[PDB]
RNA sequence: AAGCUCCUUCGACGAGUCGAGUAGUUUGGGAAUGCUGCUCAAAAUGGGAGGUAAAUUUCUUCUAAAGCUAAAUACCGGCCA
RNA sequence: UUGACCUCGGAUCAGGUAGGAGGACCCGCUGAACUUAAGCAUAUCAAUAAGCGGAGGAAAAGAAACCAACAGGGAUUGCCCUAGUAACGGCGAGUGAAGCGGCAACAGCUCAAAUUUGAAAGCUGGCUUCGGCCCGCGUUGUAAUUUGGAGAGGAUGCUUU
C-alpha cells in the first residue's frame, strides 16, 4: 500500500550500485 | 507647413490600448487560483499583510526590476488579499 | 584608403552593355506573355516625406482601399486587372485621396477589359 | 480551448504546480539518455504554436546540453546545439523548431519538432511539404531556424544595419571597389 | 561624482519615460526621501536637472552643459568623501527672487546635515555656485592650506565642473503652477 | 543481486516518488476519485448515449443513400475532447463531466475541476483515460460530457448529477484545497530519524 | 493548392485587358 | 522538500542543483586556513623541500653540461 | 581545368548544348496580337502599332519621335 | 510560516451563472447537418454508377 | 618501413604504426583535403581520372533524362 | 461553393520571451550597435521605437518572441557557345 | 483468470531515408600574425587568411514590434549619388554607416490562438477483378472556416463557377 517493500528494494539496489562504482579505484578499498 | 484637408480615420484593428477580452482576464484569474505563487510572490505576501508596504515595494523591484514592474505585482498581489480575505 | 586587401574585391562592369540586353529581352518576354496587356503595373502618386522633397511627387507602391473604393473598383478584382494594392499607406488628407481616385478614373477609360472565358 | 490556459499556466514557471512538475521531470530526463525520442510534447500548447501536428511524420526529440560558457562566449546559443544534435542522429527528418521545458543547474532541457519530408502524409499535405524541397536540408546547421535568425540579426531597423541581409555579405558588398567603363 | 559628495542621498536605476512626473513622489516616499535630484536625458544628447522637495514643495527644471565629471586628469585636487563642504553662493542669489528659490534648494541638496553619522569630521572642500550669464555655474574645490611667510588658503579644482541654465520653477512637486520662465532658453 | 532492467526500475521508482513528494493541490485533488458504484452507474447511463461506431456510420449512411436512390431528430450522444468539452462548460452547456485521472501531462487537465466548479458543471473524476476510451470507441479519452439526454433518460441523468455531488463533491470538499502525498512508511521514517541525529551534534554548512 | 487558394483563383482569375495610347 | 524522500532522489539533485555564485580569493584563503592541519609544515618537512627544490635545478644543470 | 583538359584528351563526344531558353521572346498563337506581332521590331514598335501601352510608368529617358507606348 | 498552505479559494468561490462567450449561435447547429447529406449525395453517385 | 601501401588512394602513404593514411586519411571517410595546398586539390580532383557516371550525365540531361524507346524500333 | 452590403450580436493575436544586473566579443553607434553566458525574472485601455524645454513626461508610428515565397543580385566551379 | 491503456523493446519484418564528392559564388561557427601609427597600451591589417559544419542554380533576405516628423513613405534585393557626411577614435595612425532621392525588379501569403459537435467531415498502408475492401493513425485534435490596415455569425440582394 504505503510501498515499504518496494522502496526496501530501490534502496538496496542503489548502495549496491554505489559500493560497486566506488569500489573500482582500490584507493577506496 | 502646408494646409491640407486632414481627414478622418477608421480605427485600426492593430489596436490593443481597447477594452480587453474578457475571456484572457477569466483565464488568467482562474489560472493564478490554481497555480499558487512563486516564492518570491509569497515573502511579497506576508509583507503585505504585515503592514510592510515600503519593504514590499523595495523587495518586488530588486526581483522584477523596474518600479513599473513593481507597482502592478504590488497591486496584484494586494488583490488577492482582499480577495482572499472576502472568500474566508 | 587602400589598407585592406582591395585587389581581391573588385567589380568590373565589363558586362554593362551585355546586362542591358539581357534586361531588354527579359522585358519582352514578360510582353510575349501578356500579349495585350501592359508589362507593368499601374501605381499611385506620392508625396515625398522629407521637407527637402514635399514639393515633388513620384510613384507609389500601390493604391489605398479607401482611393480604390470611391474610384468604384473591388479590392479583389484591382490586381487582377493590372493595379497595385498597398494595404499600409493611409491618405490622411483629402488631396492625396482625389489625386489617386483621379488616376484611377482615367485608367478606367482607357482599359479594354475582356470576356472571362 | 485547454490551449489557452496551458499558455498562462507556462507563464508561470515559478508557480507551486508548475514549480513541481518540473521539479520531477527534471529528475526522469536525467534517468533517460542524453537525447531520447519522447513519443509526446510535455508542453502541448508551445508545441502547437511552433507548427506541431498529430500526423504521421512529426516527431518530437527531447534533448539535454551542459550549459555555461567554453570566458569566450559561444555567439550561438545553447538552443543551437541542442537543435543540431538532434538533426545529427535523426539525418533522414527535418528539423522544424524547438522550444524550453526544463532548465536545471548542470544543464537545458529542450524538445525539438521534426517533420519527415519522405512520408507521403507530409509530400500531399500544402503547409508543409515547403520542407520536402531541397533547399531546407539542415536549416539548424546552416542558422535557419527561430534561434539561428536571432543570432544572425535579421531584424529591420537602424539598430541592424550592420547584420540583416547578411554580415558578411554586408562586409564584402562595402568593401568591394566598383570600376566602371566611363569613369 | 555628485553622489559621492552626498553622504545623505542614494542613487536609482533607470527611470520610465512613459509613466509621470508625480511618480517621482511615491518612489522618494518609497525611501524616506524629501529631496529629488533627477536626471533627465533627451536623444542621449542632452542633460536635464531637477531639484524637488517631494511632498510638495518647489521644483526647479534645468539644462545641464558642458560637463566635465572626475577621472579626467586635469584637476589634481581631491576632498573626503562625504565630507561637510563649505557652500559658496552669489550676489545674484540674494537680490533675484527666482535665485532664492534655487539657493535654498541647493541648500538642502548639498547641505549634508551637521550630525549625520556617513559624513567626515574635518572640512576640506568648497562647493561654489555662480550666476555670470543666464545660468549658474558649479565649481568643487579643494581648500589647500600653506604655511604663511615671515596659515593662507590656496584653492585647486577636484571635482565636477557644469553649467545650469533654469528654465522653469513650479510649485508642487513635479507640477503645479509655473512661477518663472526663462522666455530665453534657446534649446538644442 | 539481480539487477532490474532500466525501464523497470525508472517506472518503479516514479511509484515511489508519487508517495512520497507531497504533491500541490490542483494534483492533489485528482488522487480521490469515485468508488466502483458510482462509476458502475455513471457507465451505465453513458453506455446508453455511445457514439456510432465507424462501421455503424456507414451503414446508416448507406441506408439513407439507397432510400433517396429509389426528417430526423437530433441525435444525442456523448461529447468528448479536451478542446471541446472545454468550450462545452465555458458555455455552460454540459450537464455532466467526467475527467480522467491518468493524463500523462498533468498540466492538460489540472484547471478542468476548478474551472468546472467555477461554472457551476457537476463533475467527477474517473479512474481510467483509457476506460473512458472505449466509451468512445478511441484508446484514450482525457474526458468525456454529456450535454443533452433523451427524454427516457432526462430522471436517470438528474438522479446522477445528485448522487455524484453528493457522493463525490462533498467528500472532497476539504481534500481539495489539502496538500497531498507524506506516505512515509517505515523504511522513510528511519531515515529522516537518522537523518536529524547526524546535525544533531553539529552542522556542516 | 489549399482549398481556400482554390476559391481565390476560381472566381477571381487573372483577366485579359489592354489600355488604349 | 527533503525530509521524507529517496537516497536515490536527492543525491541526484545534490549533484545537479549547485546553486552557482561567485567565491572570493578572501574567501577562499580562509577556507585553506582554517583546515590546514597542524602538522602540515613542520620544520623538517619545509627543510626537505628546499633540499629537494636544490638538487632539481643542480641535476637539471648537469644535463645542460 | 583537368576535366577540361580530360574531355579534350578523350575520345568521347562533345555534348553541344542547343539555345534552348526558358521564356519565349514573341506571342504565339492563334490571336491578334499573336497574328499581328512582328519579330523583327521591339516592344514599344509593336505597341505602337497596336495603338496600346507598353509601360503604365514614369519614362525613364528619351523615347523615339513617333514612339507612343510609354506613358 | 506554513511550507505547505491551503489553497484559499479566492475566484471559483463566486459563481457566475453565464456562458463566457456572447458570440450568437450558427443556424447549422439547429439545422441537419450539411456534411452528411453531401457524404450520402456522394454515395448515391456511386450507387447509380454501379 | 615507417609507410605502407593505402588501400583508397594507392599512395604508399598508409602509416604502419598510426594506421592512418598520410595522403587521404583512409579510415576517416572524408578524404584528406586542405586550402592551403591548392596544388594537392588539383592532383586528386574530380576529372583526374576516369569519370565513369558523370561523363554520362550531361548526354541523358540534353535530352530531358527521357525513358522508354523509339516509335517503331524493333 | 464564392465576392460584397448591412448590423438592437461577437471579435480569441506567439514567455525562461521581453526586461533589469553582470562578463566576453563586436559595431561608426553605453538611449548598451548587435550577439552570447550567468543571476533575477514580467504586462494587458498591453508592449516596442521615436519626436518634444514647452509644463508633463501629452504627441507620432509599429505589433517581437511561429512559418512560406518568384524577380531584379553573386559566380575563378558544371554543360556548352 | 481474462482484457484494455501507457511506456519501453525484438525482428535479414513492409516501404523509405542520411552519410561521400564538389565547394567559383552562398549560410553559419571558429579564428591569427607579419605589416601601419603612436612614449607605452588600445587600435590597424580584420570581424580577413588558415580550420569546421550546411545548401542551390542561385543561395540568403523578405511582406514592418520599419523609415520618418513629412503636404509623408510603405516587404526584400541590387546600381548611382547620399559620402569620406553623421558617429566613434591622444577627435593619432585612423575607422566609418544610414534615411530621403533617380533607377532595375516587383507578389503576395500560411498557421497557433474558436466547438463540425445535427454526426473525424481528415490521412498513412496493403488486398484487389482497379469496381472497391479491410489494418491502422488520430479526439492529449486530422478536415473545412479565420490571420488584427483583419475576421466571425446572422439578414438581405445582386453577382460568380
Ligand atoms: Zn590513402
Not at chain 3, 31 to 54: E, G, H, Q
Not at chain 4, 2 to 17: H, I, N, R, T
Not at chain 5, 49 to 73: C, D, I, R
Not at chain 9, 23 to 30: E, V
Amino acid at each position: 500500500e504505503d510501498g515499504d517493500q518496494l522502496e526496501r528494494e530501490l534502496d538496496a539496489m542503489y548502495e549496491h550500485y554505489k559500493e560497486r562504482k566506488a569500489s573500482q579505484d582500490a584507493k577506496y578499498r | 507647413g502646408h494646409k491640407t484637408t486632414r481627414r478622418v480615420l477608421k480605427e485600426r484593428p492593430s489596436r490593443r490600448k481597447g477594452a480587453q477580452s474578457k475571456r484572457t482576464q477569466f483565464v488568467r484569474s482562474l489560472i493564478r487560483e490554481v497555480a499558487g505563487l512563486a516564492p518570491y510572490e509569497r515573502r511579497v505576501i506576508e509583507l503585505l499583510r504585515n503592514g510592510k508596504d515600503k519593504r514590499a515595494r523595495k523587495f518586488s523591484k530588486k526581483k522584477l526590476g523596474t518600479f513599473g514592474r513593481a507597482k502592478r505585482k504590488c497591486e496584484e498581489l494586494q488583490r488577492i488579499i482582499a480577495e482572499s480575505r472576502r472568500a474566508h | 584608403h587602400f589598407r585592406k586587401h582591395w585587389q581581391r574585391r573588385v567589380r568590373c562592369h565589363f558586362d554593362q552593355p551585355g546586362k542591358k540586353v539581357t534586361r531588354r529581352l527579359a522585358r519582352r518576354a514578360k510582353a510575349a506573355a501578356l500579349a495585350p496587356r501592359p508589362v507593368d503595373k499601374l501605381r499611385p502618386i506620392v508625396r515625398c516625406p522629407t521637407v527637402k522633397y514635399n514639393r515633388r511627387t513620384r510613384l507609389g507602391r500601390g493604391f489605398t482601399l479607401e482611393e480604390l473604393k470611391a474610384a468604384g473598383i473591388p479590392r479583389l478584382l484591382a490586381p487582377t486587372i493590372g493595379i497595385a494594392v498597398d494595404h499600409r499607406r493611409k491618405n490622411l488628407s483629402e488631396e492625396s485621396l482625389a489625386a489617386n481616385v483621379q488616376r484611377l478614373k482615367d485608367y478606367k477609360a482607357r482599359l479594354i477589359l475582356f470576356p472571362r472565358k | 480551448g485547454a490551449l489557452k490556459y496551458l499558455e498562462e499556466l507556462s507563464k508561470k514557471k515559478q508557480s507551486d504546480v508548475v514549480r513541481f512538475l518540473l521539479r520531477v521531470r527534471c529528475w526522469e530526463y536525467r534517468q533517460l539518455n542524453v537525447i531520447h525520442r519522447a513519443s509526446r510534447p510535455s508542453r502541448p500548447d508551445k508545441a502547437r504554436r511552433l507548427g506541431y501536428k498529430a500526423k504521421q511524420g512529426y516527431v518530437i526529440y527531447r534533448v539535454r546540453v551542459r550549459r555555461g560558457g567554453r570566458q569566450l562566449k559561444y555567439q550561438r546559443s545553447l538552443r543551437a546545439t541542442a537543435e543540431e544534435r538532434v538533426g545529427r542522429r535523426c539525418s533522414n527528418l527535418r528539423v522544424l523548431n524547438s522550444y524550453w521545458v526544463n532548465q536545471d543547474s548542470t544543464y537545458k532541457y529542450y524538445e525539438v519538432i521534426l517533420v519527415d519530408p519522405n512520408h507521403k502524409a507530409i509530400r500531399r499535405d500544402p503547409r508543409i511539404n515547403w520542407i520536402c524541397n531541397p533547399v531546407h536540408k539542415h536549416r539548424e546547421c546552416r542558422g535557419l531556424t527561430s534561434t539561428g535568425k536571432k543570432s544572425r540579426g535579421l531584424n529591420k531597423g537602424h539598430r541592424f544595419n550592420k547584420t540583416r541581409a547578411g554580415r558578411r555579405k554586408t562586409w564584402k558588398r562595402h568593401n568591394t571597389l566598383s570600376l566602371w567603363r566611363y569613369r | 561624482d555628485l553622489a559621492s559628495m552626498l553622504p545623505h542621498g542614494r542613487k536609482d536605476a533607470k527611470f520610465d519615460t512613459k509613466s509621470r512626473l508625480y511618480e517621482l513622489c511615491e518612489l522618494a516616499e518609497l525611501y524616506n526621501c524629501n529631496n529629488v535630484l533627477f536626471f533627465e536625458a533627451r536623444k542621449g544628447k542632452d542633460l536635464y536637472m531637477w531639484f524637488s522637495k517631494v511632498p510638495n514643495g518647489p521644483t526647479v527644471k534645468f539644462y545641464a552643459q558642458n560637463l566635465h565629471t572626475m577621472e579626467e586628469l586635469h584637476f589634481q585636487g581631491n576632498c573626503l568623501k562625504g565630507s561637510r563642504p563649505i557652500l559658496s553662493f552669489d550676489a545674484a542669489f540674494e537680490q533675484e527672487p527666482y535665485l532664492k528659490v534655487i539657493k535654498e534648494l541647493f541648500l538642502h541638496t548639498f547641505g549634508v546635515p551637521q550630525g549625520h553619522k556617513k559624513s567626515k569630521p574635518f572640512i576640506d572642500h568648497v562647493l561654489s555656485f555662480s550666476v555670470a550669464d543666464g545660468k549658474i555655474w558649479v565649481r568643487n574645490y579643494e581648500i589647500r592650506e600653506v604655511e604663511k611667510v615671515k596659515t593662507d588658503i590656496n584653492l585647486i579644482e577636484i571635482g565636477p565642473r557644469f553649467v545650469l541654465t533654469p528654465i522653469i520653477i513650479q510649485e508642487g512637486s513635479f507640477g503645479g503652477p509655473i512661477l518663472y520662465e526663462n522666455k530665453r532658453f534657446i534649446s538644442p | 543481486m539481480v539487477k532490474w532492467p532500466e525501464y523497470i526500475r525508472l517506472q518503479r521508482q516514479k511509484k515511489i516518488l508519487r508517495m512520497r513528494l507531497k504533491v500541490p493541490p490542483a494534483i492533489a485533488q485528482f488522487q480521490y476519485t469515485l468508488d466502483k458504484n458510482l462509476a458502475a452507474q455513471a457507465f451505465k447511463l453513458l453506455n446508453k448515449y455511445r457514439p456510432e461506431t465507424k462501421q455503424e456510420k456507414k451503414e446508416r449512411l448507406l441506408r439513407e443513400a439507397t432510400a433517396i436512390k429509389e426528417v430526423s431528430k437530433k441525435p444525442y450522444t456523448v461529447k468528448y475532447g479536451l478542446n471541446h468539452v472545454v468550450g462545452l462548460i465555458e458555455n455552460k452547456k454540459a450537464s455532466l463531466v467526467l475527467i480522467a485521472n491518468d493524463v500523462d501531462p498533468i498540466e492538460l487537465v489540472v484547471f478542468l475541476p476548478a474551472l468546472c466548479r467555477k461554472m457551476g458543471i457537476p463533475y467527477a473524476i474517473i479512474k481510467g483515460k483509457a476506460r473512458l476510451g472505449t466509451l468512445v470507441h478511441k484508446k484514450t479519452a482525457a474526458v468525456v460530457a454529456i450535454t443533452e439526454v433523451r427524454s427516457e433518460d432526462k430522471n436517470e441523468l438528474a438522479k446522477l448529477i445528485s448522487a455524484v455531488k453528493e457522493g463525490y463533491l462533498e467528500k472532497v470538499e476539504d481534500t481539495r484545497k489539502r496538500w497531498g502525498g507524506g506516505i512515509m512508511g517505515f523504511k522513510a521514517q528511519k531515515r529522516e530519524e537518522k537523518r536529524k541525529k547526524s546535525l544533531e551534534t553539529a552542522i556542516k554548512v | 493548392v489549399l482549398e481556400k487558394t482554390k476559391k481565390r483563383l476560381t472566381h477571381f482569375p487573372q483577366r485579359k485587358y489592354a489600355v488604349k495610347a | 522538500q527533503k525530509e521524507g524522500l529517496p537516497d536515490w532522489f536527492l543525491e541526484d539533485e545534490a549533484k545537479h542543483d549547485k546553486p552557482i555564485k561567485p567565491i572570493t580569493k578572501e574567501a577562499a584563503q580562509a577556507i585553506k586556513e582554517k583546515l590546514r592541519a597542524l602538522n602540515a609544515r613542520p620544520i623538517k618537512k619545509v627543510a626537505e623541500a628546499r633540499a629537494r627544490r636544490k638538487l632539481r635545478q643542480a641535476k637539471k644543470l648537469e644535463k645542460l653540461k | 581545368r583537368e576535366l577540361q583538359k580530360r574531355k579534350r584528351r578523350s575520345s568521347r563526344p562533345t555534348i553541344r548544348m542547343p539555345n534552348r531558353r526558358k521564356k519565349a521572346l514573341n506571342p504565339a498563337g492563334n490571336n491578334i496580337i499573336a497574328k499581328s506581332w512582328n519579330k523583327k521590331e521591339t516592344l514599344s514598335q509593336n505597341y505602337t502599332r497596336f495603338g496600346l501601352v507598353a509601360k503604365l510608368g514614369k519614362a525613364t529617358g528619351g523615347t523615339a519621335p513617333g514612339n507612343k507606348a510609354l506613358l | 510560516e506554513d511550507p505547505y498552505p491551503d489553497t484559499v479559494e479566492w475566484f471559483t468561490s463566486v459563481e457566475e451563472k453565464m456562458p463566457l462567450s456572447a458570440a450568437p449561435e450558427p443556424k447549422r447547429r439547429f439545422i441537419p447537418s450539411k456534411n452528411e447529406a453531401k457524404q450520402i449525395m456522394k454515395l448515391v453517385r456511386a450507387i447509380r454508377e454501379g | 618501413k615507417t609507410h605502407g601501401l593505402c588501400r583508397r588512394c594507392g599512395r604508399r602513404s598508409l602509416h604502419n604504426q598510426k594506421k592512418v593514411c598520410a595522403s587521404c586519411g583512409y579510415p576517416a571517410a572524408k578524404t584528406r583535403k586542405y586550402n592551403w595546398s591548392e596544388k594537392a586539390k588539383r592532383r586528386k580532383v574530380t576529372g583526374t581520372g576516369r569519370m565513369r557516371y558523370l561523363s554520362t550525365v550531361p548526354r541523358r540531361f540534353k535530352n530531358g533524362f527521357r525513358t522508354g524507346v523509339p516509335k517503331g524500333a524493333r
